Each structure stands twice: as structure tokens, then as C-alpha cells.
Design an enzyme around this catalytic site. Structure first.
Site, PDB file in Angstrom:
ATOM      1  N   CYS A 107       0.859  -1.170   0.000  1.00  0.00           N
ATOM      2  CA  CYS A 107       0.000   0.000   0.000  1.00  0.00           C
ATOM      3  C   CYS A 107       0.905   1.232   0.000  1.00  0.00           C
ATOM      4  CB  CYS A 107      -0.930   0.004   1.213  1.00  0.00           C
ATOM      5  SG  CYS A 107      -2.057   1.421   1.174  1.00  0.00           S
ATOM      6  N   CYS A 110      -0.498   4.298   2.097  1.00  0.00           N
ATOM      7  CA  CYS A 110      -0.683   4.180   3.536  1.00  0.00           C
ATOM      8  C   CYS A 110      -0.251   2.861   4.171  1.00  0.00           C
ATOM      9  CB  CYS A 110      -2.077   4.601   4.025  1.00  0.00           C
ATOM     10  SG  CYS A 110      -3.306   3.635   3.231  1.00  0.00           S
ATOM     11  N   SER A 111      -1.182   1.917   4.271  1.00  0.00           N
ATOM     12  CA  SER A 111      -0.878   0.703   5.042  1.00  0.00           C
ATOM     13  C   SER A 111      -1.866  -0.432   4.814  1.00  0.00           C
ATOM     14  CB  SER A 111      -0.817   1.038   6.539  1.00  0.00           C
ATOM     15  OG  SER A 111      -1.969   1.770   6.958  1.00  0.00           O
ATOM     16  N   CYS A 112      -2.743  -0.266   3.823  1.00  0.00           N
ATOM     17  CA  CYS A 112      -3.792  -1.202   3.549  1.00  0.00           C
ATOM     18  C   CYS A 112      -3.296  -2.635   3.421  1.00  0.00           C
ATOM     19  CB  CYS A 112      -4.506  -0.789   2.290  1.00  0.00           C
ATOM     20  SG  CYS A 112      -4.860   0.935   2.474  1.00  0.00           S
TER      21      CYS A 112
HETATM   22 CO   LIG Z   1      -2.906   1.605   3.386  1.00  0.00          CO
END
Ligand SMILES: [Co+2]
Lengths: 203, 228
Positions: A107, A110-112
Site C-alpha cells: 500500500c 498508507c498501510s492497507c
Molecule cells: Co494503506
């Protein structure tokens, strides 16, 4: 990396702790946060939801060609056959490693991450070092950081999770595992193998 | 927005820090930060797209080096202030109080069964973002498309490294909440969603890996037709 401007980790932790306790106190007074709510969320992702769930999906795909077809057709619906699904895996797309193709997921924004099959992501996945580089130099990154050499003739597909679609890697089944039980096979399946940064465990 | 958070393709960020093992939560404040997400979501601080946008508005140096869940704290405060649900001055006073008195108690409060029910339903039921729309999809598998060069200041899912790049439609998924409206408080306004394949040479130039591609998800307004 050194930043001469940065406080010590201990000072940073002290400050964050006070800020979070302060915010916590206010949300508690608003009636929207409680100690039991906090403990319940933590218990779920410490003890109930984790990569052992993805492993169950992987080994079923390895040992059941029809299930594997369903998994690749519709990740969410297939995983629900095993009672697996939910928050941040509402939409899952599984992608299959082969002799010709290697998949790795990121991701960048972000951090998905597919919580229902992998649990919460490790910190390195969420951090800017992996996220920045893996879309740009995946072959080099896999070799240098993970000791995983993907021959230049083999295609690397990097999946950037910019939407709510959650990508999960179905690693290849290791050689020497003919006729193994699902439980035995599951020992070879790692979080890393379902992110694509490592193969499933050899031997 | 063109924030530093959009790190795909950025050089010089350093080596990956990957301890051999690590706990899910490294400190008690992380558990609290994590659980605050369904709490503030239920209370209408923000939806998911708005949540992301709050993080994107962080001080970039703080973003780059702070513990992950600190990002979450920043966006809770951002939206608490935005909605008038958090008084900043009171928050600052309470922060100093817990600096000086770290073992002081939290406020007395009643437990609420409905908050546990919410947690359980959200975790196991999910918060699906898929929606039905009346329009059919504009694009289909195999379509060669070009990603928008638009550069909105507000929230979007338009990584700088794919802007203006062409690509081939790989799968249509259906319609979903549209970040460029939802993240900016303008509603779900759902749009068809596609995965699009971009070659490494398209993304990074003539010297790029000849045998690599990046797959990136594009809402319909992000892309326009080149060759059908
Ligand atoms: Co993310």
C-alpha cells in the site's frame, strides 16, 4: 537513519503516552470509548485474527483445485466458505504465483492490508522504506531485504492497494510435499509468503 | 493532495527496519490508538476516506519517522477539531496533566454492550464499500487507458507515480465509494473501479525493469480511453 533533530525513543514514547491518555480521557467522557471496547479490539487482533487464517485458505487451494478456482474467481466469497472474512478484507483478490509470475503487494499511499487473512500488518509493511521502493525496484528489494532472488526472466507483478480491493498472494506449493496433510502444509505458509516478499518455506 | 505520504517511487528513505519478530502492539498506547478507530467511526468523527485524509495532512517529517499508530492519533484529533467534538485547549490541558501524573486514573465511565456489539459486527461483518450505481462501466478488460494528471489539493487516491501514465485495464470489480468525494466530506458518490496494469518502463523510464509491472486501482474518473 540518523536525524540530529530527533528526540530519543524514550522521550517520544513518554510524550505519545501522555497525549493518547489525554485523548482517551476525553473520548471516555463523551461516552464513545470504554475500557471493554479497547480490550475487545486488542484481544481480537492479538489472539483471534492472524495469518494462520490465510494459511488455511492457502493449503485448501493447494489441495483442492476447485476451491482454488473459486478463490481466484472471488476471494471474498471463497474465504467465506471457511468462515473467514470481515473488516479490511471485505473485497479480496487473490493472485497466484507460478513458474512464470511472482506477485508482491503493497500500500504505497498508507498501510492497507488484508486483515481477515493476515491480521494486522507488521510495522515494516506500513513504513515508508518498503512502500517507497517495492513499486520501483521490487527485484532488488526482494533480494537485498528478504534474501529472495527472482530471476530477471521471471515477471514481477507489484499490486498497489489504492482502493478497498485487498490483494493476497497465493504462493506456490513447495516441492517435496506430495500428499502432505493440510496441517503439515500449513507449517510452510507464512505471512511473508502471502505478501509476496518470500516464497512459502522450502523442504 | 501531493503530500509526502504518497511515497511510491521516492528514493532515499533508507533501509527497511524489520526486527526478526515483534508484538502486534508494542505499547499500551498503541492498543488504545487502534481501538479508537471504531469508536470515532461510530461517533461520526470521520469515515474511512476522511480518516486517511487526516493522516495525509500531518507534518511530513513527523509522518515519516513517528510510530505508525501516532498517525491515527493525529487524524482523530484533526477530525475531532473539525467536527467540534474535541476542544483543543482542553486536550492540551489534559495532556500536561497526564505528563505530570502518568498513573492518574481515566475518567469513571459505564461500560456499554452496544460498543462491544459494534466491534464484533464491524470485525466479522466488515464495512463493505461496494455500492450499486445506475450507470454501466465505461471501460472493460483490455482497454488501454491514461491516468489523469489532475492534482487535487483535497483527498484522492492518485499516487504521483501513476499520473499521466497509460496502462491496460485489468478487471472491473464494480462500483465503490469514491475517495475524491468521500474523503473531503462530499459523500459516497460511488464510481466504477478498475485495476490497471502499468509496465515498469512506463512508470520509471527506458531503463526500468523490462519484466515487471505495477497494478494500481483506478476509479472511473481517473482514467480515459486510449485504444479500446
Ligand atoms: Co494503506
Amino acid at each position: 537513519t540518523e536525524n540530529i533533530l530527533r528526540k530519543s525513543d524514550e522521550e517520544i514514547q513518554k510524550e505519545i503516552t501522555a497525549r493518547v491518555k489525554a485523548l482517551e480521557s476525553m473520548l471516555i467522557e463523551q461516552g464513545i470509548l470504554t475500557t471493554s471496547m479497547i480490550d475487545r479490539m486488542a484481544e481480537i487482533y492479538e489472539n483471534e485474527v492472524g495469518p494462520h487464517l490465510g494459511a488455511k485458505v492457502v493449503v485448501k487451494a493447494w489441495t483442492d483445485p476447485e476451491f482454488k478456482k473459486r478463490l481466484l474467481a472471488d476471494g471474498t466469497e471463497a474465504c467465506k466458505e471457511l468462515g473467514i472474512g470481515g473488516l479490511q478484507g471485505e473485497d479480496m483478490m487473490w493472485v497466484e504465483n507460478t513458474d512464470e509470475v511472482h506477485h508482491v503487494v503493497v500500500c504505497t499511499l498508507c498501510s492497507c492490508y488484508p486483515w481477515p487473512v493476515l491480521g494486522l500488518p507488521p510495522n515494516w509493511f506500513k513504513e515508508p522504506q518498503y512502500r517507497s521502493r517495492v513499486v520501483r525496484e521490487p527485484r532488488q528489494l526482494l533480494k537485498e531485504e528478504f534474501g529472495f532472488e527472482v530471476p530477471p526472466s521471471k515477471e514481477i507483478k507489484v499490486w498497489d492497494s489504492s482502493s478497498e480491493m485487498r490483494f493476497v498472494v497465493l504462493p506456490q506449493r513447495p516441492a517435496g510435499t506430495d500428499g502432505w496433510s493440510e496441517e503439515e502444509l500449513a507449517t510452510l505458509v507464512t505471512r511473508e509468503s502471502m505478501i509476496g516478499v518470500e516464497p512459502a518455506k522450502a523442504v | 493532495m501531493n503530500g509526502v505520504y504518497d511515497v511510491g517511487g521516492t528514493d532515499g528513505l533508507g533501509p527497511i527496519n524489520r526486527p526478526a519478530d515483534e508484538p502486534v502492539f508494542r505499547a499500551e498506547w498503541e492498543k488504545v490508538a487502534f481501538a479508537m478507530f471504531p469508536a470515532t467511526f461510530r461517533a461520526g468523527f470521520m469515515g474511512l476516506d476522511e480518516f486517511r485524509f487526516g493522516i495525509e495532512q500531518m507534518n511530513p517529517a513527523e509522518y515519516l519517522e513517528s510510530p505508525y499508530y501516532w498517525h491515527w492519533i493525529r487524524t482523530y484529533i484533526h477530525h475531532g477539531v473539525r467536527t467540534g467534538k474535541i476542544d483543543l485547549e482542553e486536550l492540551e490541558r489534559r495532556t500536561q496533566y497526564y505528563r505530570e501524573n502518568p498513573d492518574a486514573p481515566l475518567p469513571e465511565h459505564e461500560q456499554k454492550p452496544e460498543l462491544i456489539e459494534f466491534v464484533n459486527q464491524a470485525v466479522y461483518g466488515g464495512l463493505p464499500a461496494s455500492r450499486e450505481v445506475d450507470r454501466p462501466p465505461k471501460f472493460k478488460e483490455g482497454d488501454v487507458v491514461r491516468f489523469s494528471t489532475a492534482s487535487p489539493k483535497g483527498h484522492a487516491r492518485r499516487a504521483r507515480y501513476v499520473r499521466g501514465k497509460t496502462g491496460t485495464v485489468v478487471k472491473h470489480h464494480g462500483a465503490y465509494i469514491y475517495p475524491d468525494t468521500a474523503g473531503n466530506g462530499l459523500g459516497e458518490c460511488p464510481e466504477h473501479l478498475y485495476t490497471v496494469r502499468f509496465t515498469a518502463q512506463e512508470l520509471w523510464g527506458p531503463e526500468g525493469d523490462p519484466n515487471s509491472s505495477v497494478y494500481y486501482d483506478c476509479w472511473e474518473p481517473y482514467i480515459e480511453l486510449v485504444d479500446t
